[PDB]
Design a protein around this ligand. Structure first.
Ligand SMILES: CC(C)(COP(=O)(O)OP(=O)(O)OC[C@H]1O[C@@H](n2cnc3c(N)ncnc32)[C@H](O)[C@@H]1OP(=O)(O)O)[C@@H](O)C(=O)NCCC(=O)NCCS
Lengths: 1021, 92
């Protein structure tokens, strides 16, 4: 899409990026005045208004400003102020469009003669670039394309200055011929390496002083933004001059601008009764065409669309806006809502219809105030159930909703909404049954659709031989052939894919817009690839022109960019064309017919498949050439391809407004090149160049011998009429329909629409990862960091699924801080160091040390809590518990230190103990353990509470003594093993620290000397 | 299970496993049943040839694999992994 630029921005980059020796004068000398400014700031920051005289212009892309009286010529500064006083911010009409004027540009006026103002322009065409010069300047040139000097510089060639000094300036004064030529050459260096499309200087004010631009007109290719973001910068694309945008149009523009889908809405008149909400671009163009040709010219309220599969919230907002905009006032004949569309490819109809019923059932009252009637037509994946949903919403809410499927014509519902009808060398055989493909990209859904198409077409071998994905190694992907599973090799380089597969004669290029050019250029130097399909939407037009010229040099057939692909029923299908198998089997695309078709956009090829299925014996072949401006194959490269093939008996072409391509089809009829019956229609008349309108194309096609209907509603009728007349002389022999080999459907599709039930494993009452936020136990991660809970809080959430109080989380953190490292001598730290010195990695070292936390090392946490809990809940005093554990062996776990005894406390038992005494209500098991401590410190001086015993008993007090745990949760967490987890998670910090320490000291492999071992082996076994 | 027993739903499978079919009436190794494993008189080197390489190795190569497993057995308790196993076993 090459669209216009503001002229301030045009001369901005023109002064910024020209490269020629001719002096462009008045550089960086422009001003912009708005109704949203005062004058003094740009008065003092632009001192050069204080020196020269001025010329002012409206900066809103206004066509022909001279004869309409909008330019102020040769006026001084305060004179410009009094000239701009009744003009800046007031209404004006140009052409047939009105509006306010909010932008004006001031430029230093130059005194000159009208005899040496000149005209130059460079515009883009398909076969190259046209550079046109004319010596008669000014706006009074008139007819420019018959008298001016034109030169077409080809694609992939550089301008010679000798050709422009020979051919272009032939009617120019020679005193200025050596200057401007270099300037024009420099401007071509501005035209090409800034990715322009259309650029006029009219007039080019060149004097003896130098060169000057006064007026510019440029359409630039925005899709090359990824090439020019470092060179354009903050570039704005203005709208055309028309009426002021409504705030709801601005809201739909904002919702399109934040989202990835395509949302469009433009009102024709706000008090119309025919409101349309169509899914599809060419579909909505055809619906608005059929409305404006069936008498609904005046009260067609809007045209807009929702496509690219929008979300539920996005289509709810779109349907909310379009339902509110027809609520404001009432119309005595009643209002009509047309929710139409063509056959969708992969979109579930029920999701978008769930958005629509969320808008409708919330707006049921105000919609049945204004006497509305809703007509719905749909098709695609799961359309019948969505039609049933919106019909039952119409039946409960009382609003009349007439749902329709693929058995109706597409635009019949606006014929019966308005009451006009009742309410009920290049090859010629591209694809074959032995065609093998190579797919560029990770597109397993498209490859699986191609294999499913091959299975339902009774084919022997898959269409896809390999895939090419450069971001991973050579492996195999698992795909389905009916019921059986096959493997398709995924290669990394394309040369590896071509060496293993010499029978591949088509490549499907699913690359992005910025990497399809390099992939296609690297593809075209392989001689086995005879045809390429480019899928990407938005390849800039110079790059696809280079692709066209190398394809024409090499002789390969590019199915053009921005296409869905092409489908030849019975043999081959490109990627995702057709859609799911519901659309392939519903439109009978598994057996060959005798009708070919060519479309431009892809969204209408589904409806053409449906029309040729329901009126004719079927499609033989069908190719969408693409929505780009310069497709890799036009209409003619495929109509010559169909005219030479003997299998097809009639051709159908659906064109678009714009471009004189169908007149070549007329010319091919009048010379006798095309003999087979042609049925054309150029969609989108809607006139509410003059040879590029669809009514002129339809008129010149209807006169040349092409069966052209009166509207789109009669297209299936005229195809059926030509078909029955072409059977009537006996050249089409319809074969009797064989049933296709059926497939099992899918698991994901049958569970997405919810008709299969599977029992699940892994019940996980922890950490919902699905959704928009990571939820912990029941609390989102933003609430985790907002409620200011630390690592003790998230251990409370992950381990216990409970929001612990703020002292218990800090106690958990304190326990993780004291159960960290305890030196390298101990058993697990030793194993981690022996592992780290063997050079392993962090996980194996930590893991080899962690797998010693058992009963003897690290198991006093859980045992010293089970023992004291089984003693305290049995109901014996401590002086009997010590003697009970004295008559059985088995020392009290959690009692005793080897050094820190009494009058010498352990000082990490003490920090914990004064935490549990202060911030911690009702601690009976710690009091019991301290009474056992009082009894045992009388026996020995070094029998104190361990840290491994005090954390155990204080953690049982933490569980059963605060809130949140009853007593069977609190004992289950003490039985399952949530106290081993405290030691393991604490000691993992020390073990990772030991690993990093032995990696930082760079120690070698450990060997453990033989005089510490004392081998005690048997004599001779 | 009922829709896949009568075969009207299709699910792509993971875990492609070119080794050890446990389903059926016999345990099949690489391609060879367990009764053929013990009937052809292949030892532990034969079943390493079947499980690891999916190939029926010749009778000297299986015996060489067994010989390598016999010499790459223990090399005393001083070495690093034997040390870690003993520190782990003494921690009970
Ligand atoms: C299908 C389609 C969207 C292709 O998808 P795509 O955008 O190419 O998806 P990809 O995964 O290939 O693109 C990923 C991009 O992000 C980049 N990327 C991906 N992962 C990345 C990572 N981890 N780090 C950095 N960059 C990464 C890649 O570089 C790639 O862009 P580049 O290769 O051009 O640089 C497009 O071809 C299409 O729309 N086709 C159909 C056209 C249509 O609908 N028209 C029919 C009617 S006209």
């Amino acid at each position: 899409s090459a669209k216009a630029i503001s002229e301030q921005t045009g001369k901005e980059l023109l002064y910024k990026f020209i490269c020629t020796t001719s002096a462009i004068q008045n550089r960086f000398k422009y001003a912009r005045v708005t109704p949203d400014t005062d004058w003094a700031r740009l008065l003092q920051d632009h001192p050069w208004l204080l020196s020269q005289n001025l010329v002012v212009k409206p900066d809103q892309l206004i066509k022909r400003r001279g004869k309409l009286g909008l330019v102020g010529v040769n006026l001084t500064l305060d004179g410009v102020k009094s000239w701009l006083k009744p003009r800046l911010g007031q209404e004006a009409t140009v052409g047939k469009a009105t509006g306010f004027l909010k932008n004006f540009l001031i430029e230093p006026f130059v005194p000159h003669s009208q005899a040496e103002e000149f005209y130059v322009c460079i515009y883009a065409t398909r076969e190259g670039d046209y550079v046109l010069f004319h010596h008669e300047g000014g706006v009074d040139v008139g007819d420019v394309d018959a008298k001016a000097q034109k030169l077409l510089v080809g694609v992939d060639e550089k301008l010679n200055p000798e050709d422009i000094k020979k051919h272009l300036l032939v009617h120019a004064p020679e005193d200025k011929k050596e200057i401007l030529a270099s300037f024009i050459s420099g401007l071509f260096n501005f035209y090409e390496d800034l990715y322009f499309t259309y650029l006029e200087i009219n007039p080019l004010v060149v004097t003896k002083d130098g060169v000057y631009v006064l007026d510019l007109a440029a359409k630039v290719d925005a899709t090359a933004d990824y090439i020019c973001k470092v060179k354009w910068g903050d570039i704005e694309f203005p709208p055309p001059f028309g009426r002021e945008a409504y705030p709801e149009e601005a809201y739909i523009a904002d919702l399109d601008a934040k989202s990835g889908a395509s949302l469009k809405l433009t009102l024709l008149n706000p008090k119309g009764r025919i409101w349309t909400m169509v899914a599809g671009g060419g579909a909505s163009v055809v619906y608005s065409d059929t409305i404006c040709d069936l008498g609904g010219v005046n009260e067609l309220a809007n045209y807009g669309e929702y496509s690219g599969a929008p979300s539920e919230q996005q289509t709810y907002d779109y349907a909310k806006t379009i339902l509110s905009l027809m609520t404001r006032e009432k119309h005595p004949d009643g209002k009509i809502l047309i929710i139409g569309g063509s056959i969708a490819n992969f979109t579930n109809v029920a999701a978008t219809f769930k958005g629509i019923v969320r808008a409708i059932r919330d707006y049921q009252g105000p919609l049945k105030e204004h006497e509305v009637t809703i007509f719905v037509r749909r098709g695609g994946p799961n359309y019948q159930e969505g039609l049933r949903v919106m019909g039952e919403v119409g039946k409960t809410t009382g609003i009349p909703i007439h749902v329709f499927g693929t058995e109706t014509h597409m635009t019949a519902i606006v014929g019966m909404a308005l009451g006009h009808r009742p309410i009920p060398g290049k090859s010629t055989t591209l694809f074959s049954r032995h065609t093998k493909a190579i797919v560029w990209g990770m597109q397993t859904r498209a490859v699986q659709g191609m294999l499913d198409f091959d299975y339902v077409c009774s084919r022997d071998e898959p269409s896809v031989a390999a895939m090419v994905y450069p971001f991973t190694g050579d492996h195999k992907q698992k795909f389905y052939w009916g019921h059986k599973e096959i493997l398709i090799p995924v290669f990394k380089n394309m040369a590896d894919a071509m060496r293993k597969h010499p029978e591949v004669d088509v490549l499907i290029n699913f690359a992005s817009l910025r990497s399809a050019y390099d992939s296609t250029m690297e593809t075209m130097n392989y001689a086995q690839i005879r045809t390429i399909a480019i899928i990407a939407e938005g390849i800039p037009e110079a790059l696809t022109r280079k692709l066209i010229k190398k394809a024409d040099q090499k002789g390969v057939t590019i199915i053009g960019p921005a296409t869905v692909g092409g489908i030849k029923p019975g043999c081959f299908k490109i990627g995702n064309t057709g859609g799911m198998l519901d659309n392939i089997l519903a439109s009978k695309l598994y057996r060959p017919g005798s009708v070919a078709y060519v479309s431009r956009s892809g969204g209408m090829s589904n409806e053409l498949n449906n029309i040729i299925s329901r009126t004719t014996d079927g499609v033989y072949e069908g190719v969408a050439i693409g929505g780009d401006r310069y497709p890799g194959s036009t209409f003619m490269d495929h109509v010559l391809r169909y005219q030479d093939t003997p299998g097809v008996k009639m051709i159908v072409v659906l064109g678009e407004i714009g471009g004189t391509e169908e007149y070549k089809i007329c010319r091919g009829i009048k010379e006798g090149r095309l003999t087979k019956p042609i049925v054309c229609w150029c969609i989108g008349t809607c006139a509410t160049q003059a040879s590029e309108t669809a009514v002129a194309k339809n008129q010149a096609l209807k006169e040349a011998g092409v069966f052209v209907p009166r509207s789109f509603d009669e297209l299936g009728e005229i195809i059926q009429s030509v078909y029955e007349d072409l059977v009537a002389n006996g050249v089409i022999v319809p074969a009797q329909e064989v049933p296709p080999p059926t497939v099992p459907m899918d698991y994901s599709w049958a569970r997405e629409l919810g008709l299969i039930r599977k029992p699940a494993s892994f019940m996980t009452s922890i950490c919902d990862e699905r959704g928009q936020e990571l939820i912990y136990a029941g609390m989102p991660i933003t609430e985790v960091f907002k409620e200011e809970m630390g690592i003790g809080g998230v251990l409370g959430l992950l381990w216990f699924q409970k929001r612990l109080p703020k002292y218990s989380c800090q106690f958990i953190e304190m326990c993780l801080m004291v159960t960290a490292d305890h030196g390298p001598a101990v058993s697990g730290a030793h194993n981690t160091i022996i592992c780290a010195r063997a050079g392993k990695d962090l996980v194996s070292s930590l893991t080899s040390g962690l797998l010693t936390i058992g009963d003897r090392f690290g198991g006093a946490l859980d045992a010293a809590a089970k023992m004291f809990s089984k003693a305290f809940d049995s109901g014996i005093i401590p002086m009997e518990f010590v003697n009970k554990m004295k008559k059985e062996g088995k020392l009290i776990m959690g009692i005793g230190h080897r050094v820190k005894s009494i009058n010498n406390p352990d000082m990490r038992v003490q920090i914990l103990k004064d935490y549990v005494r202060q911030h911690f209500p009702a601690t009976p098991l710690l009091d019991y353990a301290l009474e056992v401590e009082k009894i045992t410190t009388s026996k020995k001086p070094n029998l104190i509470l361990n840290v491994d015993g005090l954390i155990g008993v204080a953690f049982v007090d933490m569980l059963r003594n605060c809130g949140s745990f009853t007593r069977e949760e609190a004992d289950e967490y003490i039985d399952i093993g949530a106290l081993n987890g405290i030691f393991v998670l604490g000691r993992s910090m020390g073990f990772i620290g030991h690993y990093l320490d032995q990696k930082r000291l760079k120690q070698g492999l450990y060997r453990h000397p033989w005089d510490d071992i004392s081998y005690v082996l048997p004599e001779h076994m």
